[PDB]
Design a protein around this ligand. Structure first.
Ligand SMILES: Nc1nc2c(ncn2[C@@H]2O[C@H](COP(=O)(O)OP(=O)(O)O)[C@@H](O)[C@H]2O)c(=O)[nH]1
Ligand SMILES: [K+]
Length: 307
């Protein structure tokens, strides 16, 4: 029997913001690591494990939006980063691209985790257009460096947050919507590992769908009542925040969780929604979990790769 160790690593300001908000939300059976140049921010981190990088470089300040400083800071702290990761079977690295620390250090952190054998997933943001072309260009170079260093990468363009707010939505509420991509992905994988399914998926199946793949989609949908399976499957694959949509996916891990009423017909319906949306012949790794506590609720978890 195998119990996978999952860790979430925030790198730089935005990544450490995400870690703090996820801890506040509550996230058990997952270990958090906070990595930053900025000692003032790191002192406010809620993470159990904190690594200040580049103190000789920046004297405790941030990188001042220069990615070369973040890269050097991370490389010089490799051993400390390895020690915090040790034991991990899966590592999520989260960072905002475009600044100095995340852009430069997050790809180093990802490569360290990958060369320790952890399944390594990046979830990163691109800057708002109003932040200017230079920052977009720097972020683009960071995204490409992340893709070369992870097993799978999820990119959230911050511009998509402007598609989901009204004129009054607090910025922090919008940021929590972006956080949900990583948080619900981690939770869905943590639930998959913890529960034996009736059609069982385990961590080896997560590795099949995510190892050495590139772009990825991770989504969850919950629905009740009539047409719940179709509606949950549509919710799982249809986030407006994602650079990589479901279209073009050639591998999908899909788990359906329901009560004792979970029907074979509705499982096929949900699988068909995902196949049709990908517009490809999808290699599906299909799982089912009967949770008797659930009455009329159905949960559909999707991880899509192979773009
Ligand atoms: N969605 C989101 N984006 C953020 C957040 N914090 C910063 N950003 C974005 O991330 C980019 C880099 O900022 P930051 O992570 O603070 O820079 P760094 O510490 O030097 O890596 C910014 O230009 C913003 O686009 C956050 O909490 N949420
Ligand atoms: K399992």
């Amino acid at each position: 029997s195998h119990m996978a160790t999952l860790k979430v690593i925030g790198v730089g300001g935005g990544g450490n913001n995400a870690v703090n908000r996820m801890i506040d939300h509550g996230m058990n059976n997952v270990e958090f690591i906070a990595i930053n140049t900025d000692g003032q921010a790191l002192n406010l981190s809620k993470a159990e494990s904190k690594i200040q990088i580049g103190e000789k470089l920046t004297r405790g300040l941030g990188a001042g939006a220069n990615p070369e400083i973040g890269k050097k800071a991370a490389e010089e702290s490799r051993e400390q980063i390895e020690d915090a990761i040790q034991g991990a079977d899966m590592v999520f690295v989260t960072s905002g691209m475009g600044g100095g620390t995340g852009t430069g250090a997050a790809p180093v952190v990802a490569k360290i985790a990958k060369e320790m054998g952890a399944l390594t997933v990046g979830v990163v943001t691109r800057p708002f257009s109003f932040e200017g072309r230079k920052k977009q260009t720097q972020a683009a170079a960071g995204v490409e460096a992340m893709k070369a260093a992870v097993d799978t990468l999820i990119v959230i363009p911050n511009d998509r947050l402007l598609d989901i707010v009204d004129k009054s939505t607090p910025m922090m509420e919008a940021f929590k919507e972006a956080d949900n991509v990583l948080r619900q992905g981690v939770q869905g994988i943590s639930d998959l590992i913890a529960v034996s399914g009736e059609v069982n998926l385990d961590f080896a199946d997560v590795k099949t769908i995510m190892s050495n793949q590139g772009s990825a989609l991770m989504g969850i949908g919950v629905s009740s009542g009539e047409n719940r399976a179709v509606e949950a499957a549509k919710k799982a694959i249809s986030s407006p925040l994602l650079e990589t949509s479901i279209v073009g996916a050639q591998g999908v891990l899909m788990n359906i969780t329901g009560g004792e009423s979970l029907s074979l017909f509705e499982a096929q319906e949900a699988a068909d929604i995902v196949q049709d949306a990908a517009d490809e012949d999808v290699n599906m790794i299909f799982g089912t979990v009967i949770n008797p506590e659930l009455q009329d609720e159905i949960v559909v978890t999707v991880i899509a790769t192979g773009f």
